[PDB]
């Protein structure tokens, strides 16, 4: 079995390194770049510190404990080793939901995705999260509240060679609830409305994709620790069928989660550019999703000189004629900024909404639609013009008649649905459902 010993040594040692390596990579990136100084990043920084202290002060000694099949560091470190262990786990689950609540108050604020907290206010919150979860994790252990009274524990408590965590089931459940389930339940509830409010006002916008990353951070965390925490309240409510080979194995599922977050953060483009440098390497929203933004002059799907969020600068092939009116609209001679591309969009959209109301074939249709399917109509008038949207009266009156499923089968036969099918299907599917499920 000496093959098993050395082979597990390399895996555990690899695990310990991946934790320390990736988490320090996060702490460094948020500390370097000013672009990354956000309140959410400050919570992620402390979240990384929890995983970092895991990889330094916890996972190693637990790796040494297993392959040596015995505890080596005396009794004092034993009480401390498991207090730091609980301190890290409780601080993460609390911090993960101080994010979910901070994300909630933000999506109900003028700038969705903008935290309402001061950078120094966010610091204090993190300071108390560690100050509180430290009290509720060290005091019960340093004061012996966890301890059991069966001789098998009283002996292990006496020998400085045994460091198994025998606990009276009062501790085992009480601490399991206050420090895991209670924050976990709040988190899953609070952040769920966050996701809902995000589409009411899927997962295509940049900061929307960021919230699904915050979700995946929470998600993998619960999935890695819930088996450990589930089969330990049953293990006390029903007498033990949980053999110790399994309890420490499900706990190591919780240990490796500390290496997961740096990987997950590579879903944000903002974090990858930081990592790569560190290693020497709503109607308006709906249309930005499927029109894209480009700050120069480019050829579109039909070959015309467009710019920004799908603004046709001209139909002529001469780029001289494209610039000719590109600078006629900005104000200067642009020969445009992201802010210039923005106010040309807000002025092109209103032109398409008045262009809907000055059409007697579209206005009665646009009048009877909800907020969402109106936006679906304006997306067609934007991409085409009111003259072409007056085309399929068949579909135009099917929408008015509130025969959504019928109107959705006719629209998918238009030439529109096969020259830009991926975008067409998104406008037709929101016609069908009245929701934003596709955007």
């Amino acid at each position, epitope marked *: 079995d000496e093959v098993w010993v050395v082979g597990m040594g390399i895996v555990m040692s690899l695990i310990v390194l991946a934790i320390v390596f990736g988490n320090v990579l996060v702490i460094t990136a948020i500390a370097k770049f*000013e*672009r*990354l*100084q*956000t*309140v*959410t*990043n400050y919570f992620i920084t402390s979240l990384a510190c929890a995983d970092l202290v895991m990889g330094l002060a916890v996972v190693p000694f637990g790796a040494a404990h297993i392959l040596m099949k015995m505890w080596t560091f005396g009794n004092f470190w034993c009480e401390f080793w498991t207090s730091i262990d609980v301190l890290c786990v409780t601080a993460s689950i609390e911090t993960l939901c101080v994010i979910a609540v901070d*994300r909630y108050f933000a999506i109900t*604020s*003028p*700038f969705k*995705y*903008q*935290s*309402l907290l*001061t950078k*120094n206010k966010a610091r204090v919150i993190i300071l108390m999260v560690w100050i509180v979860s430290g009290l509720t994790s060290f005091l019960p252990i340093q004061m012996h509240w966890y301890r059991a009274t069966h001789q098998e524990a009283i002996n292990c408590y006496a020998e400085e060679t045994c460091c198994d965590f025998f606990t009276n089931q009062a501790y085992a459940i009480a601490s399991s609830i206050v420090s895991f389930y209670v924050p976990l339940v709040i988190m899953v509830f609070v952040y769920s409305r966050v996701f809902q409010e995000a589409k009411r006002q899927k997962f295509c916008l940049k*900061e929307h994709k*960021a*919230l699904k*990353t*915050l979700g995946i951070i929470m998600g993998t965390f619960t999935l890695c620790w819930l088996p450990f925490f589930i089969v330990n309240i049953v293990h006390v409510i029903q007498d033990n069928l949980i053999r110790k080979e399994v309890y420490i194995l499900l706990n190591w599922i919780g240990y490796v989660n500390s290496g997961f977050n740096p990987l997950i953060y590579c879903r*944000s483009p*903002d*974090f990858r550019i930081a990592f790569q440098e560190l290693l020497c390497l709503n109607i*308006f929203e709906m249309l930005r999703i499927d029109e894209g933004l480009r700050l120069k002059i480019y050829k579109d799907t039909e070959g015309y000189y467009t710019i920004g969020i799908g603004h046709l600068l001209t139909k002529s092939p001469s780029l001289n004629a494209a610039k000719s009116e590109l600078d006629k609209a900005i*104000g200067r001679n642009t020969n445009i*900024t992201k*802010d*210039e591309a*923005e*106010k040309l969009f807000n002025q092109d959209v209103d032109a398409a909404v008045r262009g809907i109301l000055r059409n007697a074939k579209l206005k009665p249709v646009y009048d009877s639609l909800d907020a969402v399917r109106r936006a679906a109509l304006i997306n067609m008038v934007f991409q085409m013009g009111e003259t072409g949207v007056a085309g399929f009266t068949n579909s135009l009156r099917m929408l008015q008649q509130k025969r959504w499923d019928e109107a959705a089968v006719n629209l998918a036969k238009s030439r529109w649905y096969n020259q830009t099918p991926n975008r067409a299907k998104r406008v037709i599917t929101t016609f069908r459902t009245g929701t934003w499920d596709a955007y």
Partner: nanobody
Amino acid sequence: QVQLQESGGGLVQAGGSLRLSCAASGSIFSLNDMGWYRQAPGKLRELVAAITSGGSTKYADSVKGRFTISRDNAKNTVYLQMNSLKAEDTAVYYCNAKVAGTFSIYDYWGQGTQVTVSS
């Protein structure tokens, strides 16, 4: 999704004074950092003054003592008081907003406004 609008530029004789002012909308202006940049002809776009949401202010060395950046959160506006004007201060002045989102901070610029000085 936020918007910026400068106001209060133009000409004035040297030694004159101007008060450029920028109004913002789209975010909690209280939690945003604010600053003024200028692009003189034949030069690159340089910072003149910045005010952080905490109040701290740095200035361009050329404008130190002459310009004062200041903030009014009640009206969502930030003010550059250009005093003791010099012909070198001739540039299109820009209003900048730094709005923090989830994992990153976003930059937001005004259209700009001209200031011509006469020796």
